[PDB]
Amino acid sequence: APEDLLERLLGEMELELIELRRALAQTIATFKSTERQRDAQQLIAQRWYEKAQAALDRGNEQLAREALGQRQSYQSHTEALGKSLGEQRALVEQVRGQLQKLERKYLELKSQKNLYLARLKSAIAAQKIEEIAGNLDNASASSLFERIETKILELEAERELLNPPPSPLDKKFEQWEEQQAVEATLAAMKARRS
Amino acid sequence: ALVEQVRGQLQKLERKYLELKSQKNLYLARLKSAIAAQKIEEIAGNLDNASASSLF
């Protein structure tokens, strides 16, 4: 039944709105981890910067040469990680936009599901009554209501044969004599006790 | 519009129901009368008193 699928499909969506949710956690987790590593390396280079900050004074330049020459190796690492961190920022920003747009589309779909289902039951419940009224049409000769009248007519006229109605001749006389019967019996009434 | 439209269907249909219900008793009543008053005259036929095929 199409109605049955409408609830299962939306259920399978819900598994991925959380699955994708978990994926973003891993991505952002790496971004935090990558960020932290950058501080440590620059801190070590920063420490060598303070260490080199204590030699060039009072003419000890030769010592400063070696100290800063060592810092250069650490400096390269800082640059490489710095660019990577900026690049990874776009991905976390971009991926979040997908989730936000998709999440809105979900609840929007959910609302429409009930409305169409509701119209279906109304389009089935109010739909399923009128046919049985067709069996009670009262507008044709294929209904129980009308066929019942035929059965009544069949039965009522069944014994119009068994007991035939009185012929018009007697029907033309009973009233004809009755009028005299009331008046003639009254003829003495209106005269004897006038 | 849908909620207004759907309600009209129910109101019209609901009236048609009780209207059908009232007619059901009337036709059934006429049937029993068309059967009870119907089922007597035949046995009077066995007591016709008008032919030579009766018990009387």
Tab-separated table of C-alpha atoms in Angstrom:
chain	number	residue	atom	x	y	z
A	1	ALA	CA	0.000	0.000	0.000
A	2	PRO	CA	1.489	3.416	-0.885
A	3	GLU	CA	0.386	4.760	2.502
A	4	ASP	CA	2.460	2.094	4.264
A	5	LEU	CA	5.679	3.102	2.495
A	6	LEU	CA	5.193	6.764	3.414
A	7	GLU	CA	6.037	5.998	7.057
A	8	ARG	CA	8.955	3.609	6.511
A	9	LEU	CA	10.807	5.806	4.015
A	10	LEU	CA	10.730	8.782	6.377
A	11	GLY	CA	12.012	6.488	9.112
A	12	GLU	CA	15.049	5.548	7.038
A	13	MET	CA	15.752	9.252	6.532
A	14	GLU	CA	15.991	9.682	10.303
A	15	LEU	CA	18.892	7.217	10.481
A	16	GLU	CA	21.016	9.424	8.212
A	17	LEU	CA	20.204	12.786	9.793
A	18	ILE	CA	22.055	11.364	12.814
A	19	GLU	CA	24.613	9.409	10.795
A	20	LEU	CA	25.597	12.577	8.947
A	21	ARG	CA	25.502	14.232	12.368
A	22	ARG	CA	28.148	11.800	13.610
A	23	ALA	CA	30.296	12.388	10.526
A	24	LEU	CA	30.472	16.125	11.213
A	25	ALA	CA	31.691	15.328	14.727
A	26	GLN	CA	34.691	13.444	13.340
A	27	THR	CA	35.516	16.240	10.890
A	28	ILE	CA	35.317	18.993	13.504
A	29	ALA	CA	37.255	16.793	15.935
A	30	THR	CA	40.204	16.646	13.536
A	31	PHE	CA	40.053	20.415	13.063
A	32	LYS	CA	40.416	20.932	16.811
A	33	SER	CA	43.248	18.396	16.972
A	34	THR	CA	45.049	19.986	14.023
A	35	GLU	CA	44.639	23.405	15.631
A	36	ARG	CA	46.257	22.300	18.894
A	37	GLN	CA	49.341	20.848	17.193
A	38	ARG	CA	50.065	24.239	15.628
A	39	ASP	CA	50.327	25.956	19.015
A	40	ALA	CA	52.840	23.424	20.338
A	41	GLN	CA	55.232	23.781	17.401
A	42	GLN	CA	55.167	27.582	17.452
A	43	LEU	CA	55.551	27.499	21.235
A	44	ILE	CA	58.729	25.448	20.822
A	45	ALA	CA	59.879	27.875	18.135
A	46	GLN	CA	58.745	30.686	20.423
A	47	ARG	CA	60.870	29.198	23.204
A	48	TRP	CA	63.867	29.121	20.863
A	49	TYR	CA	62.989	32.735	20.026
A	50	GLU	CA	63.386	33.616	23.707
A	51	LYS	CA	66.486	31.413	23.857
A	52	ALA	CA	67.896	33.307	20.876
A	53	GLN	CA	66.636	36.482	22.590
A	54	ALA	CA	69.321	36.003	25.274
A	55	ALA	CA	72.483	35.517	23.169
A	56	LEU	CA	72.965	38.314	20.627
A	57	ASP	CA	73.326	40.791	23.494
A	58	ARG	CA	76.826	41.796	24.656
A	59	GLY	CA	78.309	40.871	21.284
A	60	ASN	CA	77.671	37.102	21.262
A	61	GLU	CA	76.486	37.135	17.660
A	62	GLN	CA	78.101	33.830	16.648
A	63	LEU	CA	75.912	32.088	19.217
A	64	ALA	CA	72.833	33.824	17.805
A	65	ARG	CA	73.660	32.473	14.336
A	66	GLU	CA	73.335	28.848	15.438
A	67	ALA	CA	70.299	29.519	17.631
A	68	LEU	CA	68.239	31.079	14.838
A	69	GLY	CA	69.517	28.554	12.308
A	70	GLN	CA	67.884	25.875	14.444
A	71	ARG	CA	64.603	27.809	14.594
A	72	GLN	CA	64.282	27.691	10.805
A	73	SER	CA	63.466	23.975	10.762
A	74	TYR	CA	60.590	24.536	13.188
A	75	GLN	CA	59.420	27.621	11.286
A	76	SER	CA	58.737	25.598	8.135
A	77	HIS	CA	56.426	23.239	10.026
A	78	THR	CA	54.395	26.186	11.316
A	79	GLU	CA	53.743	27.496	7.804
A	80	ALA	CA	52.628	24.126	6.430
A	81	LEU	CA	50.126	23.502	9.226
A	82	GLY	CA	48.852	27.083	9.145
A	83	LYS	CA	47.657	26.808	5.551
A	84	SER	CA	46.062	23.410	6.200
A	85	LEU	CA	44.043	24.737	9.136
A	86	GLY	CA	42.558	27.540	7.044
A	87	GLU	CA	41.652	25.137	4.246
A	88	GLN	CA	39.886	22.739	6.621
A	89	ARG	CA	37.727	25.589	7.941
A	90	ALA	CA	35.841	25.818	4.644
A	91	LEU	CA	34.900	22.130	4.732
A	92	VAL	CA	33.356	22.315	8.206
A	93	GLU	CA	31.491	25.486	7.236
A	94	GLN	CA	30.398	23.973	3.915
A	95	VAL	CA	29.283	20.647	5.389
A	96	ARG	CA	27.200	22.345	8.084
A	97	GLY	CA	25.264	24.262	5.441
A	98	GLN	CA	24.252	20.976	3.832
A	99	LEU	CA	22.908	19.657	7.134
A	100	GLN	CA	21.007	22.863	7.890
A	101	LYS	CA	19.367	22.915	4.459
A	102	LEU	CA	18.589	19.193	4.564
A	103	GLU	CA	17.210	19.304	8.108
A	104	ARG	CA	14.662	21.950	7.132
A	105	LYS	CA	13.577	19.857	4.146
A	106	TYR	CA	12.871	16.902	6.444
A	107	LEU	CA	10.279	18.440	8.766
A	108	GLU	CA	8.754	20.109	5.708
A	109	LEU	CA	8.256	16.669	4.169
A	110	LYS	CA	6.884	15.320	7.450
A	111	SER	CA	4.131	17.940	7.633
A	112	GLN	CA	2.907	17.198	4.108
A	113	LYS	CA	2.713	13.462	4.829
A	114	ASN	CA	-0.146	13.816	7.314
A	115	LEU	CA	-2.081	16.202	5.072
A	116	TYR	CA	-2.067	13.858	2.076
A	117	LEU	CA	-2.849	10.852	4.273
A	118	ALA	CA	-5.720	12.748	5.895
A	119	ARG	CA	-7.195	13.663	2.513
A	120	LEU	CA	-6.873	10.011	1.488
A	121	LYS	CA	-8.933	8.681	4.400
A	122	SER	CA	-11.506	11.412	3.808
A	123	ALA	CA	-11.286	10.513	0.116
A	124	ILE	CA	-11.889	6.894	1.196
A	125	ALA	CA	-14.243	7.153	4.182
A	126	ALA	CA	-16.624	9.700	2.673
A	127	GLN	CA	-15.896	7.762	-0.526
A	128	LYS	CA	-16.877	4.314	0.765
A	129	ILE	CA	-20.374	5.316	1.954
A	130	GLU	CA	-22.006	6.559	-1.243
A	131	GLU	CA	-21.727	3.149	-2.930
A	132	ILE	CA	-23.724	1.330	-0.255
A	133	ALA	CA	-26.311	4.079	-0.617
A	134	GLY	CA	-26.300	2.964	-4.246
A	135	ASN	CA	-27.691	-0.368	-3.073
A	136	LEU	CA	-30.333	1.794	-1.356
A	137	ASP	CA	-30.405	4.191	-4.294
A	138	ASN	CA	-34.110	5.079	-4.150
A	139	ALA	CA	-33.535	6.439	-7.671
A	140	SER	CA	-33.510	3.322	-9.890
A	141	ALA	CA	-34.962	-0.199	-10.041
A	142	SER	CA	-31.810	-2.004	-8.878
A	143	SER	CA	-31.936	-1.052	-5.158
A	144	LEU	CA	-33.421	-2.961	-2.221
A	145	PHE	CA	-35.715	-0.043	-1.369
A	146	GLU	CA	-37.432	-0.011	-4.757
A	147	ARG	CA	-37.448	-3.793	-5.168
A	148	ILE	CA	-39.150	-4.028	-1.773
A	149	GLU	CA	-42.005	-1.952	-3.186
A	150	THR	CA	-42.320	-4.458	-6.032
A	151	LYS	CA	-42.561	-7.280	-3.494
A	152	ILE	CA	-45.240	-5.313	-1.642
A	153	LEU	CA	-46.990	-4.716	-4.962
A	154	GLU	CA	-46.602	-8.401	-5.807
A	155	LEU	CA	-48.094	-9.422	-2.460
A	156	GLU	CA	-50.783	-6.734	-2.333
A	157	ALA	CA	-51.971	-7.608	-5.841
A	158	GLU	CA	-51.524	-11.344	-5.215
A	159	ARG	CA	-54.924	-11.549	-3.499
A	160	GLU	CA	-56.614	-8.969	-5.652
A	161	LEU	CA	-57.070	-12.241	-7.541
A	162	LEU	CA	-58.107	-14.365	-4.557
A	163	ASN	CA	-60.725	-11.840	-3.380
A	164	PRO	CA	-61.777	-9.894	-6.490
A	165	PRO	CA	-63.062	-6.378	-5.859
A	166	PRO	CA	-66.823	-5.864	-6.058
A	167	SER	CA	-68.002	-5.073	-9.560
A	168	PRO	CA	-69.125	-1.504	-10.319
A	169	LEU	CA	-72.728	-2.670	-10.753
A	170	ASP	CA	-73.198	-3.376	-7.045
A	171	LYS	CA	-70.912	-0.440	-6.257
A	172	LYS	CA	-73.334	1.593	-8.376
A	173	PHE	CA	-76.309	0.323	-6.332
A	174	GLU	CA	-75.266	0.164	-2.672
A	175	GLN	CA	-74.721	3.923	-2.604
A	176	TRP	CA	-77.715	4.399	-4.906
A	177	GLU	CA	-79.973	2.489	-2.512
A	178	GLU	CA	-78.176	3.855	0.559
A	179	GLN	CA	-79.123	7.443	-0.287
A	180	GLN	CA	-82.746	6.310	-0.364
A	181	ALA	CA	-82.141	4.198	2.741
A	182	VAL	CA	-81.132	7.210	4.840
A	183	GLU	CA	-83.706	9.519	3.239
A	184	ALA	CA	-86.552	6.995	3.006
A	185	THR	CA	-86.112	5.921	6.620
A	186	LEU	CA	-85.790	9.643	7.330
A	187	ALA	CA	-88.784	10.366	5.079
A	188	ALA	CA	-90.970	9.061	7.898
A	189	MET	CA	-88.710	10.752	10.465
A	190	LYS	CA	-89.112	14.168	8.826
A	191	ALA	CA	-92.881	13.560	8.568
A	192	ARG	CA	-93.961	11.501	11.590
A	193	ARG	CA	-92.011	13.737	13.996
A	194	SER	CA	-91.770	16.774	11.709
B	1	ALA	CA	-10.638	25.826	2.188
B	2	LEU	CA	-10.059	22.090	2.636
B	3	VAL	CA	-11.314	22.039	6.229
B	4	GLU	CA	-14.328	24.134	5.233
B	5	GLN	CA	-14.967	21.975	2.160
B	6	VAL	CA	-14.595	18.651	3.976
B	7	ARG	CA	-16.987	19.701	6.743
B	8	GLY	CA	-19.692	20.441	4.184
B	9	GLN	CA	-19.448	16.867	2.928
B	10	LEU	CA	-19.945	15.492	6.438
B	11	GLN	CA	-22.890	17.790	7.154
B	12	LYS	CA	-24.648	16.848	3.916
B	13	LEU	CA	-23.903	13.144	4.367
B	14	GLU	CA	-24.974	13.095	8.018
B	15	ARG	CA	-28.412	14.448	7.124
B	16	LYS	CA	-28.794	11.795	4.424
B	17	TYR	CA	-28.134	9.056	6.988
B	18	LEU	CA	-30.957	9.725	9.450
B	19	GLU	CA	-33.215	10.350	6.454
B	20	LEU	CA	-32.436	6.838	5.226
B	21	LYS	CA	-32.947	5.423	8.719
B	22	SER	CA	-36.486	6.796	8.998
B	23	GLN	CA	-37.558	5.274	5.680
B	24	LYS	CA	-36.231	1.846	6.683
B	25	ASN	CA	-38.826	1.343	9.419
B	26	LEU	CA	-41.685	2.556	7.224
B	27	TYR	CA	-40.961	0.091	4.419
B	28	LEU	CA	-40.358	-2.734	6.894
B	29	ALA	CA	-43.624	-1.918	8.664
B	30	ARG	CA	-45.564	-2.000	5.396
B	31	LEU	CA	-43.914	-5.338	4.608
B	32	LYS	CA	-45.090	-7.038	7.805
B	33	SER	CA	-48.557	-5.577	7.288
B	34	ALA	CA	-48.256	-6.709	3.667
B	35	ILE	CA	-47.325	-10.148	5.060
B	36	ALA	CA	-49.386	-10.492	8.247
B	37	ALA	CA	-52.667	-9.224	6.814
B	38	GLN	CA	-51.459	-11.065	3.704
B	39	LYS	CA	-50.929	-14.467	5.333
B	40	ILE	CA	-54.450	-14.757	6.803
B	41	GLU	CA	-56.650	-14.578	3.711
B	42	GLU	CA	-55.178	-17.781	2.253
B	43	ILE	CA	-56.121	-19.931	5.244
B	44	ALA	CA	-59.594	-18.434	4.955
B	45	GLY	CA	-59.394	-19.839	1.433
B	46	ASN	CA	-59.293	-23.304	2.980
B	47	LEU	CA	-62.447	-22.146	4.801
B	48	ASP	CA	-63.646	-20.285	1.722
B	49	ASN	CA	-67.385	-20.871	2.184
B	50	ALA	CA	-67.626	-19.776	-1.466
B	51	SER	CA	-66.536	-22.863	-3.446
B	52	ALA	CA	-66.507	-26.666	-3.193
B	53	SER	CA	-62.830	-26.996	-2.236
B	54	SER	CA	-63.065	-25.775	1.400
B	55	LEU	CA	-63.486	-27.783	4.603
B	56	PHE	CA	-66.673	-25.891	5.477
